[PDB]
Structure 1
């Protein structure tokens, strides 16, 4: 339960290109810090470097919507890699089941554009239904927006813990 050493093990696996194992230990460190993601993970543990490493681990495993979810963990939301990852079609993750963990309206706008351009209308309807949510309104009061982001963050990281532990 030493998150510093868990991050060290995750990075050791990350350098050797064991991306599944690296993700395992990053999520283990996060679950040490926040009590199984019940609280916010401290920024001095899930730093932008750690989150970027997690992004690379998810991308190299073809879990592209998971890359899109992790892209809004960063202090400055990285839309370039998020949009690049969502363009991929060889996904090995649940895809449309993860659209409930996206709280950024820009990511969902791009998802709706992508599913409309590529012709999948039902997934496009799922993304539109996700945008058309009261708690998702970008013009909401701030404390509502962090609460939506925090609950989606908790659910997403717990789902990843279930998948990767």
Structure 2
């Protein structure tokens, strides 16, 4: 139950194209740092480099909805990678049901746009309902939005760590 060593071993499994193990031990370090993602993971452990290695591993495992939702964990939201991976149609991560973890209005708007382009009416309606949420509105006084971000971060991290362990 050290977090730096779970990170180190996640990186070691990462370099050797063991991306499932890299995700496993990245998530292990993250859940050690918080209390099962109940708290907020300290920024000095889930750093931008770690988030990027994780996002690459999730892409190579074809978990592209997970890629979109991970892309918003950075200090600046990396819209380009999430947009490209959301354009993928071969994903293995329960694309629609995972939408509750999207808190970015731009990313949801982009997803609704693809669903309109591809004719996925049910996923379009799901994305629209996700956008049509009062707490998700971009005009909230900077506190409902931050709390929404933290709670979606927590739910995402804990369901992810369940999938990997």
| Length-normalised TM-score, structure 1 | 0.99
- After TM superposition, give the deviation of residue 154 of structure 1 in Å: 0.4
Deviation string 1:36-92 (CA, Å, 9 cap, x unpaired) is 000010000000000011100100000000000100000010000000000000001
Task: For residue 155 of structure 1, report the CA deviation from its aligned partner.
Answer: 0.4
How far off its partner does 1:25 sit?
0.2
Distance between the aligned counterparts of 1:18 and 1:124, measured in 2? 35
How far apart are the structure 1 equivalents of 2:152 and 2:77?
16
Q: Secondary structure at the match of 2:88?
A: coil
Inter-partner Cα distance in structure 2 for 1:3 and 1:158: 16
Alpha-carbon separation, structure 2, partners of 1:151 and 1:8: 27
* Equivalent in the alignment of 1:106: 106
Match of 1:46 in 2: 46
CA distance in 1: counterparts of 2:93 and 2:7, whole angstroms: 24
Unpaired segments of 5 or more residues in structure 1?
A: none
Q: Structure 1 runs of 4+ off > 3 angstroms?
A: none
CA shift, 1:124, in A, is 0.3
- Rounded Cα–Cα distance in structure 2 between residues aligned with 1:34 and 1:45: 10
TM-score (norm 2): 0.99
Aligned length: 165
2: CA distance, partners of 1:57 / 1:40: 22
Deviation at 1:96, TM superposition (A): 0.2
Cα deviation, residue 33, structure 1:
0.1
Q: Distance in 2 between matches of 1:110 and 1:13?
A: 33
Structure 1 residue 162 displacement after superposition: 0.6
Work out the CA distance in 1 between the residues paired with 2:106 and 2:98: 15
Q: CA RMSD in A?
A: 0.4
List aligned pairs for 1:10-159, cutoff 5 A.
Answer: 10-159=10-159
- Describe the superposition over 1:113-135 as per-residue Cα deviations: whole angstroms up to 9, x where unpaired: 00000011110000000000000
Q: Deviations over 1:125-164 (max 9, x none)?
A: 0000000000000011101111000011100100001100
Distance in 2 separating the partners of 1:97 and 1:56: 22
